[PDB]
Swiss-Prot record, chain B:
Keywords: Acetylation, ATP synthesis, CF(0), Hydrogen ion transport, Ion transport, Membrane, Mitochondrion, Mitochondrion inner membrane, Transport. One of its GO terms (biological process) is proton motive force-driven ATP synthesis. Belongs to the ATPase d subunit family. It is found in: Mitochondrion; Mitochondrion inner membrane. F-type ATPases have 2 components, CF(1) - the catalytic core - and CF(0) - the membrane proton channel. In yeast, the dimeric form of ATP synthase consists of 17 polypeptides: alpha, beta, gamma, delta, epsilon, 4 (B), 5 (OSCP), 6 (A), 8, 9 (C), d, E (Tim11), f, g, h, i/j and k. This is ATP synthase subunit d, mitochondrial. The chain holds residues 60 to 117 of 174 of the full protein. The keyword Cell membrane does not apply. One of its GO terms (cellular component) is proton-transporting ATP synthase complex. Present with 6820 molecules/cell in log phase SD medium. One of its GO terms (molecular function) is proton transmembrane transporter activity. Mitochondrial membrane ATP synthase (F(1)F(0) ATP synthase or Complex V) produces ATP from ADP in the presence of a proton gradient across the membrane which is generated by electron transport complexes of the respiratory chain. F-type ATPases consist of two structural domains, F(1) - containing the extramembraneous catalytic core, and F(0) - containing the membrane proton channel, linked together by a central stalk and a peripheral stalk. During catalysis, ATP synthesis in the catalytic domain of F(1) is coupled via a rotary mechanism of the central stalk subunits to proton translocation.
From Swiss-Prot, chain C:
ATP binds at residues 163-170. It holds the Pfam family ATP-synt_ab_C. It comes from Saccharomyces cerevisiae (strain ATCC 204508 / S288c) (Baker's yeast). The lineage of its organism: Eukaryota, Fungi, Dikarya, Ascomycota, Saccharomycotina. It comes from the Eukaryota. This is ATP synthase subunit alpha, mitochondrial. Signal peptide: none annotated.
Amino acid sequence: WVRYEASLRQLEQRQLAKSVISRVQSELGNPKFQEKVLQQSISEIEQLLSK
Amino acid sequence: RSVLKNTSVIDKIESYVKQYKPVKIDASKQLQVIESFEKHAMTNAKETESLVSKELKD
Amino acid sequence: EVSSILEERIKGVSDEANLNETGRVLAVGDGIARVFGLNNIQAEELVEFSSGVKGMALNLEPGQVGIVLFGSDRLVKEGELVKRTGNIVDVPVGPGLLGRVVDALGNPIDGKGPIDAAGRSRAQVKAPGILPRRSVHEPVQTGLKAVDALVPIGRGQRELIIGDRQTGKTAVALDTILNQKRWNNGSDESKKLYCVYVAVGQKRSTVAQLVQTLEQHDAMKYSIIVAATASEAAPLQYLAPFTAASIGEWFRDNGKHALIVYDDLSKQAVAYRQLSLLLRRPPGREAYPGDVFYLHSRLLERAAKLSEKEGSGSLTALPVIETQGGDVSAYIPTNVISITDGQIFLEAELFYKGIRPAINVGLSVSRVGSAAQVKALKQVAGSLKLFLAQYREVAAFAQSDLDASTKQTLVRGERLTQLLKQNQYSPLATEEQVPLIYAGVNGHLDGIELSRIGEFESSFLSYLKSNHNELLTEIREKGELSKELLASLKSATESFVAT
């Protein structure tokens, strides 16, 4: 019973793994792909000034 | 039952073990029939003993 | 649950820092890459490529650094950015590696998630000096007669196990781990070996059978398995024994007794050969590079019985050498033999010819093994090696007529050899080995007809326990056979002989 319980958790995790891939393909579609480059830009501005 | 999530079987076998915790009765009960074999044996024992004691001195 | 653990992990991604990173890959393939930049780099660093794979910098050259890819070349490619880990190759070491299969990157291939590890420690670490080194005193008991008697094995020692491939090669070692289940599941930590099984170059399937056997004997909890299978990359295989020994050293440097079995160092040689050739460094004898001696010797001498200062830690090495045809003059075997204390050459011919386990008594030696033996196993086993090297002589010249003196030796000898044999994957207790050796030595098994020897063993042991397990308890604690015990045992054994 414990063994299959662990197996179900692993199965859930790989199911949620392919859902992560699906979410990644969605993210890279959005012009959040464009807009977040601005976020990275300002973050790097803050970061590198903190260097 | 602090790692199983597919529960409701730990209480089942807990109860099955603690239920049949009284296991079937002791098998001390041959001591009348076992005693009888000893009686037969004793008859033979005494026969041998008395005979050979007599014969030795003879 | 699974959501919470994943969420915790996602939260644990948080920002990248600036620092000296970035080399750019140029000439790559042949499992080495030539990177441009990496101007200040510690020697033998771990670098992680942005190909998501790591390599160990080997050649620091004017204007270029030549990484060696510790991992697949498939994902590495030209003009990739190589980022400095900034740290020399270290591997997590600690207490929580116990009962966890891990691969060579320390990734849990038992898949029981992140390993609990106290520290990380550099892959190469020099062996302790003369001053930290105390001569062996505690034995290692394998539970197999003759493998404790004729071959006396003691803690710290680099005690070679040499023999031919797949003669159930693994089994000799497995039995050792199993016998020491008794002591290791003990409460005395002086009687706790923490045993590491290094599986190099073995099929992942085979390792899975081994893992399953170990978990069947519930032996996983006192042992670690490190795995670098045959499929797994040769540079990883090269670093595989070294990493395992670092883990072993953490136990040793807790002053706690430990043991490490390196299966099979011969396959490390082939790996180092491959690596060397791909670094196009000139090949040595049998095409094995000239630094092959250095490779094995640096590895082997890290296994030791340290002194009281170091807390008297042990790290008993059992390195498993796979001889090509029983080529006992072959370069790799001879090089190993010279480093190692003793040999445990296993007689293949006899193995095939129904002696399991088969130990070539002549080609088994143990340099300092015999002072590890406990007095019971010195007294009872006194001169049995000589006797069976009189059996060795006797059967040498047996091949016409036999004088009664010779015949007596032959009758004992043949029967004694039968006694040595054990059932593969089922070792006997240490306590039990003492009477069995007593019987034959004290000539009780002289008369016993050859056919009933197997019966004699089981029945004798059952007899001893039933008649008086008190004797065995005494010999268990005393560990020395007193004159009274010796006489009592002579009497008791004679009693068993009668039945």
